[PDB]
Amino acid sequence: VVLTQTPSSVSAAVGGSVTISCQSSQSLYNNNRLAWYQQKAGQPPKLLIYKASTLESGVPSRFKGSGAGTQFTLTISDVVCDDAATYYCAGYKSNSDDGTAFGGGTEVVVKGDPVAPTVLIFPPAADQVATGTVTIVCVANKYFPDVTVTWEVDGTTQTTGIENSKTPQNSADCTYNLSSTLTLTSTQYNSHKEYTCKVTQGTTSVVQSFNRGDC
Amino acid sequence: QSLEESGGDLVKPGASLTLTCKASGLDLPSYFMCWVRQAPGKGLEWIACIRSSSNEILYYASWAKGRFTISKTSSTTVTLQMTSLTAADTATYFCARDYFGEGDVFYHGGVFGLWGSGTLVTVSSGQPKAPSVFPLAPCCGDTPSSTVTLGCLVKGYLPEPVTVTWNSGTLTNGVRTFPSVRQSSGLYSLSSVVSVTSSSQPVTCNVAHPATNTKVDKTVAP
Numbered sequence A: 001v002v003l004t005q006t007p008s009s010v011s012a013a014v015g016g017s018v019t020i021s022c023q024s025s026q027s028l029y030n031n032n033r034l035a036w037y038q039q040k041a042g043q044p045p046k047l048l049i050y051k052a053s054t055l056e057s058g059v060p061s062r063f064k065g066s067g068a069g070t071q072f073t074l075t076i077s078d079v080v081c082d083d084a085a086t087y088y089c090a091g092y093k094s095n096s097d098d099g100t101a102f103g104g105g106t107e108v109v110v111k112g113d114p115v116a117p118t119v120l121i122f123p124p125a126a127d128q129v130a131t132g133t134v135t136i137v138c139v140a141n142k143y144f145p146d147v148t149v150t151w152e153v154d155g156t157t158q159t160t161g162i163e164n165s166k167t168p169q170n171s172a173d174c175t176y177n178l179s180s181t182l183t184l185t186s187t188q189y190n191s192h193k194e195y196t197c198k199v200t201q202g203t204t205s206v207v208q209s210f211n212r213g214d215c
Numbered sequence B: 001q002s003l004e005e006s007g008g009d010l011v012k013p014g015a016s017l018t019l020t021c022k023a024s025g026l027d028l029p030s031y032f033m034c035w036v037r038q039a040p041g042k043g044l045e046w047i048a049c050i051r052s053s054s055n056e057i058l059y060y061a062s063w064a065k066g067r068f069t070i071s072k073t074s075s076t077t078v079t080l081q082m083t084s085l086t087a088a089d090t091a092t093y094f095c096a097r098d099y100f101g102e103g104d105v106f107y108h109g110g111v112f113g114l115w116g117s118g119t120l121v122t123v124s125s126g127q128p129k130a131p132s133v134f135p136l137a138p139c140c141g142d143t144p145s146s147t148v149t150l151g152c153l154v155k156g157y158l159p160e161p162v163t164v165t166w167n168s169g170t171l172t173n174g175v176r177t178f179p180s181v182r183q184s185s186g187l188y189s190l191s192s193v194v195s196v197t198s199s200s201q202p203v204t205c206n207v208a209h210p211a212t213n214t215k216v217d218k219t220v221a222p
């Protein structure tokens, strides 16, 4: 059996509504063996709905299961920030090859009220240069919606050596956090002086900078 | 009720490996016990289920049967024998119970109420590497403020995972630990920061890497 989950990605405002649709290649056992799951980073999936519409104990009425046979839907009403997650359908036909299947997944992004990022730059510890490679960290806190990042060294933009990583949405206030690193050889680091990190959120920007050996 | 999965160092492509799933406060044979997996940054993929009692029932995914073998070695353990492992088999491998109740009757069918935490299997030709850890503090020409953000940079480790705590898990509030990112080379890097009110005394980040049995402690000062 194959489950076709749609959409792959959806945005919703707080107090709004999300609708996810599963579609199976064959009828499911008893026309009702579809279950819905919530997953957050670092954890296994939580079971929300089973037998197409039965709520697991402890799950709010805000989650509704419906459908029958080949077509199934999860509707989340009165969307809170804790609902920001990845959701999965799981279906069953029979005790046989490919009998159980998982849908591809849907990412629920919850539009919380916007916040601009504060930016920190972290110069390399003294330890780093001695190891030959040096990496410089730049973090962006409590923000929504998403940002891009630009690295300058002596006012000239950087193309390579860069790596970004973003936190999941906060379950209380819907904000991201982001860390971005710039990696260089020690001979590249000990040549240039002015090192910059420029975060941008559409219109607003936040540059943060430091001079080598202002220490 | 817990499932604790175990198995899987980093292994070379071609190799075989056996995962185990121990069950606490519950007997496995009377329920349909399955294995599921999730590759980094990808979806769930069902592998196989087994019920050991009565008439023994086994079923597999099309891509699993012939290569992976599910079995029961005790009344509280189920195993997965993997074979001819490739780089695409790198994932977290969960263990779960397919079951739901309806009054005087038990059923099952893609209803995974009970899961273990997972066991990361990493298939790669690379050599294991413990992380270099560096402190993250603001530049020393800045004026000391009321609050301050300090962190730990966990650089260049393999395989995943690493776990970062602060002051042995007592300091929880203000902590922001970012997802790992793979380099071009193959090594992982990771950041963790924390916010504190200056006068409070010094923050230590504890970086465990069970793969190499390395556990680093780093104290950070402004």
Ligand SMILES: CC(=O)N[C@H]1[C@H](O[C@H]2[C@@H](O)[C@@H](CO)O[C@@H](O[C@H]3[C@H](O)[C@@H](O)[C@H](OC[C@@H]4O[C@@H](C(O)O)[C@H](O)[C@@H]4O[C@@H]4O[C@H](CO)[C@H](O)[C@H](O[C@]5(C(=O)O)C[C@H](O)[C@@H](NC(C)=O)[C@H]([C@H](O)[C@H](O)CO)O5)[C@H]4O)O[C@@H]3CO)[C@@H]2O)O[C@H](CO[C@@H]2O[C@H](CO)[C@@H](O[C@@H]3O[C@H](CO)[C@H](O)[C@H](O)[C@H]3O)[C@H](O)[C@H]2O)[C@@H](O[C@@H]2O[C@H](CO)[C@H](O)[C@H](O[C@]3(C(=O)O)C[C@H](O)[C@@H](NC(C)=O)[C@H]([C@H](O)[C@H](O)CO)O3)[C@H]2O)[C@@H]1O
Residues within 6 Å of the ligand: A029, A030, A031, A032, A051, A052, A053, A067, A068, B054, B102, B104, B105, B106, B107, B108, B109
């Ligand atoms: C749960 C469920 O599923 N439920 C469901 C039901 O079901 C059922 C069925 O199936 C039956 C039949 O037969 O069966 C059953 O079963 C069971 C029972 O119950 C029990 O009791 C039993 O057990 C117990 C016993 O006891 C004792 C003695 O006595 O001694 C003992 O103990 C025993 O035990 C046991 O033992 C054994 C040994 O030998 C074993 O061990 C077992 O175990 C087991 C095994 O084997 O292993 C376990 C497992 O796990 C399982 N598996 C699974 C997979 O699960 C197994 C199995 O089960 C077995 O084996 C089998 O055999 O087991 C132990 O247990 O037992 C029995 C068994 O059998 C059940 O319960 O049903 C219902 C209904 O539905 C449906 O529907 C459809 C439609 O669609 C229809 O179709 C039609 O028809 C017509 C005519 O009439 C025409 O023809 C057409 O064509 C077609 O199509 C049908 O008929 C019906 O019936 C259901 O309900 C439902 O629900 C849902 C929810 O989700 C919904 O709501 C629905 O609704 C509807 C419908 O109808 O469908 C929807 C739609 O859509 C709508 N429409 C519109 C909207 O349009 C509709 C409307 O609304 C209306 O129509 C109005 O009017 O709706 C509903 O209905 C339920 O759910």
